[PDB]
Amino acid sequence: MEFLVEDLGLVPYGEAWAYQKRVHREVVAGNRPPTLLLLEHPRVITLGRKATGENLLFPESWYRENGFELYWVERGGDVTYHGPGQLVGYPIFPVGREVRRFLRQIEEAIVRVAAGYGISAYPTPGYAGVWVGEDKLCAIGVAVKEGVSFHGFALNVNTDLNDFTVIVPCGLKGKGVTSLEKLLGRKVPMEEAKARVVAAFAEVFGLRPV
Numbered sequence: 737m738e739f740l741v742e743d744l745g746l747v748p749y750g751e752a753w754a755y756q757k758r759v760h761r762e763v764v765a766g767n768r769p770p771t772l773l774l775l776e777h778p779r780v781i782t783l784g785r786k787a788t789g790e791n792l793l794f795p796e797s798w799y800r801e802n803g804f805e806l807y808w809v810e811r812g813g814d815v816t817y818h819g820p821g822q823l824v825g826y827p828i829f830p831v832g833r834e835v836r837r838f839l840r841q842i843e844e845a846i847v848r849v850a851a852g853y854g855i856s857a858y859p860t861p862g863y864a865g866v867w868v869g870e871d872k873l874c875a876i877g878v879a880v881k882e883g884v885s886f887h888g889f890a891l892n893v894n895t896d897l898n899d900f901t902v903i904v905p906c907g908l909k910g911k912g913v914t915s916l917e918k919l920l921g922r923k924v925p926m927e928e929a930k931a932r933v934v935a936a937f938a939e940v941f942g943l944r945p946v
């Protein structure tokens with residue numbers, strides 16, 4: 737009936753990952769409610785299950801020399817970027833076998849958040865994540881272990897979208913990336929974006945936030 741929200745603020749990717757794993761263990765054990773972690777990461781490139789070297793424009797060493805951290809991870813999708821101004825959410829939820837349904841629910845929650853800003857967004861029939869026209873507003877890539885999810889979504893609120901240019905997604909996609917800031921012509925407070933995400937999750941999943 738409930739889900740727990742934890743706002744971690746700004747957290748390095750590696751430590752946040754370790755925290756995801758600890759939260760995940762507790763949810764698997766039935767010793768913690770379904771938990772939505774909300775946070776930001778310092779500039780980082782991650783490479784998921786479908787990622788290859790082709791997804792990096794420069795060598796890995798260039799990224800580390802130029803202010804990015806870089807990690808290979810087990811979530812769905814290929815390459816992505818997280819940085820300040822991007823609201824990262826990790827729903828660590830007991831989804832069982834129904835992962836496709838879970839993805840659709842994350843998508844729906846993000847579509848609701850965009851609608852709250854007067855923005856028409858859609859999952860699209862063909863591209864992972866949530867899109868506004870030809871541009872990706874929110875990336876989505878999860879992992880599921882022992883029936884509990886981790887990783888999650890990355891909603892561009894005030895992201896430096898220029899940082900996406902150095903990575904090269906593969907497969908079916910639209911043309912670009914966008915953010916609430918870009919669509920609205922002004923920065924949106926991160927505290928507010930978090931609140932709207934919590935409300936949307938509460939509505940879509942039918943759970944009370946604590």
Ligand SMILES: CCCCCCCC(=O)O
Binds near residue numbers: 813
């Ligand atoms: C925490 C969210 C990470 C989303 C990665 C998506 C990459 C892709 O769609 O290829």
